[PDB]
Amino acid sequence: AMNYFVGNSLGVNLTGIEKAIINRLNLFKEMGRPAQCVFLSWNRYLYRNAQNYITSSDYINMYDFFQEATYLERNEPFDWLSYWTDECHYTLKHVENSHDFRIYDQERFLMYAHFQDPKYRILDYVNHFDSQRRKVKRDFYDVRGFLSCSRILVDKQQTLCEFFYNPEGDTKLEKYFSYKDGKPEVQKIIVYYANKQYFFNNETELGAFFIKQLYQHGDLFFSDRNVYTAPIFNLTPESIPVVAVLHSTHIKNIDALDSSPFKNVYKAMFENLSRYRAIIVSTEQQKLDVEKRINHTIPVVNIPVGYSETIDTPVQTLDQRSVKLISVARYSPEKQLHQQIELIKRLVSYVPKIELHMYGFGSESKKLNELIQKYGLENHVYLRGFLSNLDQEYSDAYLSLITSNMEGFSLALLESLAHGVPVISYDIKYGPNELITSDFNGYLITKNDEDALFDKVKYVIDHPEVQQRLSKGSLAKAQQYSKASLIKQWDQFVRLILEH
Amino acid sequence: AMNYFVGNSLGVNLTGIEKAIINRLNLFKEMGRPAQCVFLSWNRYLYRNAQNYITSSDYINMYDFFQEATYLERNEPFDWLSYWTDECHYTLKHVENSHDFRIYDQERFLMYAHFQDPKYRILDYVNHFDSQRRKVKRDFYDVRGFLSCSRILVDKQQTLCEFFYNPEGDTKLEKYFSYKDGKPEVQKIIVYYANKQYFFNNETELGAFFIKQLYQHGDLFFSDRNVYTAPIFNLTPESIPVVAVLHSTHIKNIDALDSSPFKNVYKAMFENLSRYRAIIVSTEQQKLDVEKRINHTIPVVNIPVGYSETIDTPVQTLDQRSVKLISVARYSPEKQLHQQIELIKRLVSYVPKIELHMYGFGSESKKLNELIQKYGLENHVYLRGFLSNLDQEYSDAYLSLITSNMEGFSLALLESLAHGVPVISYDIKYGPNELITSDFNGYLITKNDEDALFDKVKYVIDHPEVQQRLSKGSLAKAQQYSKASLIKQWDQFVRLILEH
Amino acid sequence: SDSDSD
Amino acid sequence: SDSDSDSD
Ligand SMILES: O=c1ccn([C@@H]2O[C@H](COP(=O)(O)OP(=O)(O)O)[C@@H](O)[C@H]2O)c(=O)[nH]1
Ligand SMILES: O=c1ccn([C@@H]2O[C@H](COP(=O)(O)OP(=O)(O)O)[C@@H](O)[C@H]2O)c(=O)[nH]1
Ligand SMILES: CC(=O)N[C@@H]1[C@@H](O)[C@H](O)[C@@H](CO)O[C@H]1O
Ligand SMILES: CC(=O)N[C@@H]1[C@@H](O)[C@H](O)[C@@H](CO)O[C@H]1O
Ligand SMILES: *[C@@H]1O[C@H](CO)[C@@H](O)[C@H](O)[C@H]1NC(C)=O
Ligand SMILES: *[C@@H]1O[C@H](CO)[C@@H](O)[C@H](O)[C@H]1NC(C)=O
Ligand SMILES: *[C@@H]1O[C@H](CO)[C@@H](O)[C@H](O)[C@H]1NC(C)=O
């Protein structure tokens, strides 16, 4: 029996939801239960992105599946340049300040090639041109080497249809597109599978077909990317068991528990509750809020998405000269990172050896840079961008700040505690008040009360003895979220979930 | 050493030019010289169209060659209806008064299937539709059974691109198209051949490439459809010998031998004469006219496109009570068949048992039927359509009529004389003037003299002693065009045309 | 529909 | 320039 954690894809920078899935996979491995991530969306660099976290056998992508490229590794690089000049007798004209080449047969322009690396080892795409220099076709290569997709273009480079290949060059899917509000949308998909020809109207129906081909009796599905996965599970037979996992607040306005509409990302799930064996949320409070809202229609249970180990990297090696505050959060409006920049403006006149290091990425990074310049805080507030390993950054961290107005748990909060860094967080739904005991491992403060924020951060700077005591509380609280503790809950859950 | 006769294709109904090529292959076959027809254009019905005339080994089609279907035979016949209902679990709705099915699954319209035959053993094409009933793709089946071409559609069923398969379903050619003045034009061709990929701007460049793959030292090309074949031969090296064969009048106004421009269909040939070893035309007079006009730049030589054998069907078994006039001519304007319906309208006043049998096909079909219907001649004038064997129709024929304003030679005229049927023809260039001696085997009458046409036809009906005399004259004239005398002219030509 | 076939 | 259209 296999357990399948169904998300959408993996980017370059590991997000919360992707980390929750990989955490869950490492917990099932530790307990000996077979488990695989399932990715839906077409992504020809997915094998590169997954490389740094999971193995090739730890996941299945839907497009890889129909393209017979599941559990395939990289080929030894093909020397395209050398095959184009020596074998094809083409002429290559390098494009300056690029990894691109223009390809000609004598004086005739045929192809524009973009490589990914400056070593020309990874062909990315090739554009095909007709006698009038119309771009009729784009060839997209998988980072593993093979040609994954050809796109046929019409008019002003509009997508008309896509063809997906196995590594041998046989066609396995066809997609046909029409334009609606200036974007291409799928109107038909043809799949060649098990020597038959299947017809679908959209990617959701293809999703539902994929889930059905994966499923064997005794298998269990987990729906983690509900905006895509719920509609897919809605077109699968009830005989295939699936658990819905909520990753954040479930309603658009959390101060109206009874009345607020469900978020768009959960609508399709909440509108077909009886499809699901259960809902999992991260926190007690959200379990009780959700079980009320859905009038107990299906079981709701709380299993935190995050866990701690013991750390072999250094803990609380503080610089005795300066105070290092840290924010570990997306540069995104709900994290309200502008508030922590206001906090430093107020503190800098009192404690001038202060540093705030903000680890993350997103749209707000320009407004946040402009806010630091405005206040002349370039020496004190550092937008560090995204680091894939934070272990060294927690070593010398005095305090971690959270000014968010909505969490599902906050992996960053537990991660901080686990490295012995105490946290000062607004008391919001959900997670902070289950993870912080005021005056034990940090302080909870009323949502958006920036005065209480300043007062309490000032109190811990003034009292290095208090920071030492809260640090040790942080390691103790982290132990309540241990690997062993999460395995005990997942084991009981999996043993009770299937029908008997 | 192979002799290749290069035309465009063979229709469902043979053209004069297609017949000339088959005649030439039969003469080469009887004298023991290797010959093959070469056909350029994509025709998935070619194998069927060839079956009455030549062997599968007697021709190579260019699309067959790249599609790896050259010399491939008809498959074991496959039951599509049973595959779709029994194996696929689709529901078929037969379309009234057709060989067509609509195809549904899951309450959706998926496909429209058209068969060639009433026993539904030959799938012709299948149209595919998206979620909104847009026709996104057409599958075209070769009459031998395999899927030959998929066409992708944009907008108002416009042709965007075509994929061409070998019989296993591997892609061997891609064509990309753009519309110019409301018709689709090739802008790009991709061919996968000899483990390589080749790029062409148009069918001429692909033709040229095909000719160069066929050619072995010693082979000889005949260019028989010059509007396509000459532009192809203009892109092949002069070391490949080719002969130009003209099938009709060479200039637009035949009256201005010196000054009239060359017909559009022969321009590319006449603009590059030194490329060609010689010009072959059917008649003495066209030989004299063309040699003067090209200032003897290359040799010009007359070999008739038609020949006579001895006939093993009845000859001149006339019905005494009724007279049967025949026209063997395309339903196309330069044949001016309307004039013969007009002749009959006049003749029924004097011969109440007269019939005119018009054997052919073409565009004027409806306009000629409407003319017959408007004169109440439905019992005297029959459009018989195209018969592949006319042998039995000649048996009781009294006279043949030709009212054409231009002819290369006219095979129908020689066929008529060979079966003992005298001919009355306008004295036009070229062909009739050399095939008819007035008062010996028929009568030559002034171009468009409908008055004189009636007088001579009536005279021959009024005098059956004359019709018999001209019937013996006809069999005598046809003997001058014997299989044996054409072989002699062909054999001498092929022995001298190559440099030594 | 009339446009279904050719 | 018209030439920048060749790439994406
Ligand atoms: O520079 C960074 C910043 C963040 N993260 C990770 O990003 C995740 C953010 O998840 P969290 O639950 O805190 O919040 P979400 O992003 O879902 O709101 C955490 O696992 C962090 O460890 C990281 O690896 N490097
Ligand atoms: O029912 C028909 C009508 C015409 N033909 C043939 O089509 C050719 C007509 O070509 P011809 O040289 O007479 O002139 P064209 O039609 O090319 O001007 C001749 O071989 C005819 O015998 C035929 O086989 N069956
Ligand atoms: C709602 C929000 O801002 N962030 C949540 C985060 O609290 C949580 O750690 C994770 C649960 O897996 O899902 C994120 O997207
Ligand atoms: C000029 C014309 O209309 N038709 C000619 C016909 O007279 C000739 O007998 C034959 C030569 O093969 O080919 C056709 O194209
Ligand atoms: C498709 O053929 C059908 C069936 O004869 C006919 O009803 C329809 O008009 C055809 N479509 C065309 C030729 O446009
Ligand atoms: C850039 O492309 C344009 C085609 O639009 C062409 O005119 C010009 O020659 C090209 N220059 C190079 C460097 O190829
Ligand atoms: C394609 O990329 C090349 C090189 O980066 C650049 O010259 C060209 O402008 C790009 N085209 C775009 C992105 O419009």
Numbering used by the authors:
A (entry chain A), B (entry chain C): 0 to 499
C (entry chain G): 3 to 8
D (entry chain D): 1 to 8
Authors' account:
Despite the biological significance of these two glycosyltransferases involved in pathogenicity and avoidance of the host innate immune response, their structures and the molecular basis of their activity have not been investigated. This study reports the crystal structures of SdgB and SdgA from S. aureus as well as multiple structures of SdgB in complex with its substrates (for example UDP, N-acetylglucosamine or SDR peptides), products (glycosylated SDR peptides) or phosphate ions. Interestingly, SdgB undergoes a conformational change from an open to closed complex upon substrate binding. In addition to the dimerization role, the inserted domain was found to serve as a binding platform for the SD repeats before and after glycosylation. A long positive tract along the inserted domain stabilizes the binding of the glycosylated SD repeats to SdgB by offsetting the negative charge clustered in the tandem SD repeats. SdgB and SdgA share the way that they recognize monoglycosylated SD repeats as a product and a substrate, respectively, but SdgA is likely to preferentially bind a longer SDR substrate than a shorter one.
Two glycosyltransferases (GTases), SdgB and SdgA, are responsible for the glycosylation of S. aureus SDR proteins such as ClfA and ClfB. SdgB first appends N-acetyl­glucosamine (GlcNAc) moieties onto serine residues (O-glycosylation) within the SDR domain using uridine diphos­phate N-acetylglucosamine (UDP-GlcNAc) as a donor substrate. The subsequent addition of GlcNAc to the glycoproteins is catalyzed by the second enzyme, SdgA, yielding glycosylated SDR proteins in which each SD repeat is decorated with GlcNAc disaccharide moieties.
